[PDB]
Design a protein around this nucleic acid. Sequence first.
RNA 1: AGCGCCGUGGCGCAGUGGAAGCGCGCAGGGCUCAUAACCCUGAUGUCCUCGGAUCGAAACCGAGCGGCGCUACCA
Lengths: 77, 470, 134
Amino acid sequence: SNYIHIRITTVQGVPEEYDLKRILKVLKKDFACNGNIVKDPEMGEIIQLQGDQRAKVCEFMISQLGLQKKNIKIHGF
Amino acid sequence: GETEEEKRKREFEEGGGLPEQPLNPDFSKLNPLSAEIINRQATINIGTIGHVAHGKSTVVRAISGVQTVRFKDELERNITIKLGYANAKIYKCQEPTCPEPDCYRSFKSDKEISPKCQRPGCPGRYKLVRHVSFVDCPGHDILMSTMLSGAAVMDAALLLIAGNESCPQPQTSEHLAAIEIMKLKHVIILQNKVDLMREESALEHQKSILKFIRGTIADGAPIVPISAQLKYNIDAVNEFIVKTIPVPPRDFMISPRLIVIRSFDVNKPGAEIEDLKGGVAGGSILNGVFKLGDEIEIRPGIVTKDDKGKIQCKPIFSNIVSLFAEQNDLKFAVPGGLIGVGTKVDPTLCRADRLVGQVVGAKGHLPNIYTDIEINYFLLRRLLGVKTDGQKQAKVRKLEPNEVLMVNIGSTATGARVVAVKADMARLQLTSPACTEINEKIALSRRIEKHWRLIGWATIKKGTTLEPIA
Amino acid sequence: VGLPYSELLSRFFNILRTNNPELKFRIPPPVCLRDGKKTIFSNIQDIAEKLHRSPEHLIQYLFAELGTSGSVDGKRLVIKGKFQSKQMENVLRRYILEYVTCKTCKSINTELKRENRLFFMVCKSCGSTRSVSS
RNA sequence: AGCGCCGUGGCGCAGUGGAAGCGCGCAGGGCUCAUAACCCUGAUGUCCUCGGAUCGAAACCGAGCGGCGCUACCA
Ligand SMILES: Nc1nc2c(ncn2[C@@H]2O[C@H](COP(=O)(O)OP(=O)(O)CP(=O)(O)O)[C@@H](O)[C@H]2O)c(=O)[nH]1
Ligand SMILES: [Mg+2]
Ligand SMILES: [Zn+2]
């Protein structure tokens, strides 16, 4: 399992080996985009990203934490 | 228009069914090959050894048909900690016309004493040459104590080697060395993979295996190609088991004992507790005959710590309510077979891993629990189970004082502290209770690369007794 | 003595050559019809007999993967919308990798039985017993 | 094998007791020069198959299904 995906933008599905606020700090600078760490009523992790930059967050988890890069699915939307 | 179950029932009744064990038969005449012993209980234990990600439970399942569970969700796939059990019956065709290689036929536990032959054209039936028990042992680099215990229980060996991987795999060498440690030479080498291979790759692998076994203890060990998925060439393995492996000396003279390796509780959930069952200790009897309704005590038993740090041992007396062997409840037990003693021992004492390697003695014997033991140790040169990337497979160093080392005395898995070091002898201090009855075969492992690693063999010479608290 | 070893190995090779002259590929190209607004797959039962699966389980999975639950007719599944044909080729290949073909061995005849409450995956060449139902 | 949950409108969440729910989606329309933002309107269901008490059940109860999660392989 451990399904990770990006939906037009938001990233839902995040393993927590690294801190989520640290995730905000390593996203916000490079991406220059607004990001909201919102706790939905008991779904996976929610992190926002304004403007469609799905390939950019692909590059991002490539840089920071991505280790499988096969279950991450680029949604159409 | 008979249903398949009806046809099987007709074949079962035609085959004589399965006669019940006598309540009180003459034991001075009973042999492991007697008809009454052989029909409903196994007399020889056969264990399988191999490297990880090869498949041993598959071969055992193909030989017999008894499934090996592979439980605990996470362990359903990777590796199992508890041993695997499977009952197989050696059935040989009585008709001379049919070829010898396919005469033998291994069946499962509840088959009749004489099933019909499945080869087309032979109206003959099968005769029960032997009932064999199978003790699947783990072959991972982490789980050794269970494998050493089951190999101590083991009396006959089946080594599994697959061809397409590296010829000198270390795990099989380690298991063969362990078997060589504990007085066991009847080893049958089996090729796991033959189908996906070329006719010369198999020959090269066979040459490699022959080169491997030239200087070890076992010399005339046969090699047999087998399949775990296609389910062929199983009768040949049965024939080799019949021919190569005789009955180890096991008569009724020696005193009764029990070596429990698995603890099983019988508490079916959802059912009201009004109708329950006693707790089951899964133990091997290598010496003695056990009968229904006997008084028995677990020797190491209740381990407790006093407020002063002293270790108190309370032997666990209990009455035997049942002795489950093979498929049906039986009246008497045969040494050389893994039997579940279902006694009135509290079910929580048989919950998960409490009676894993514990000695148990029937009322009428006085084993000895020891705190400090004297051991005679003999070492090996190169550590087995390690793939060194081109530089001198690790040389075993001499032991040092005060090191926690795993001293698997038969089935007991304990970490002992060394108090004395010399050329051959060592004093082992045991924080966990261990007991000695006659000799006990022992394996030694150290912690050099994280997980436990075998170094050599050991034999108890003396010990400091702890008198039971009644 | 390794003399009784080579005979059994040659017998095994002869048994292989008897059973498998080719050394699975009995998976037909999917045929989906696009009637403008209605997508019809009349190949579900043919692949049911070409994969040895229970058609009810095939249909329940094919509903559980998308946001659709069409109609069963006869040997065919009916849905009313705009959809492609490559999608179910990929679906079939993944489903083959997970259920139709056992990961451990190359065989199709393997199928789903119930030994608890869930579905247990079992084989037909050997009889491997795992829990593959999600 | 039992026990603690679930039965979608594409999805998340709700009351289940007089009869389709809110929001996220989607489409369409309004705003604006225009876009975004904002505002209005829709169409997506046996809220899982079968019965009971009941003028009435999506629920109140079950005689079971399909999937979850705890025990732990439950000779
Ligand atoms: N191709 C092929 N696959 C086999 C063969 N035997 C077993 N397998 C594969 O091995 C798998 C079962 O492995 P398993 O017996 O659980 O491994 P294991 O015995 O637990 C490894 P360990 O003893 O170290 O714990 C099956 O899924 C099967 O596909 C064989 O002869 N050929
Ligand atoms: Mg196992
Ligand atoms: Zn298979």
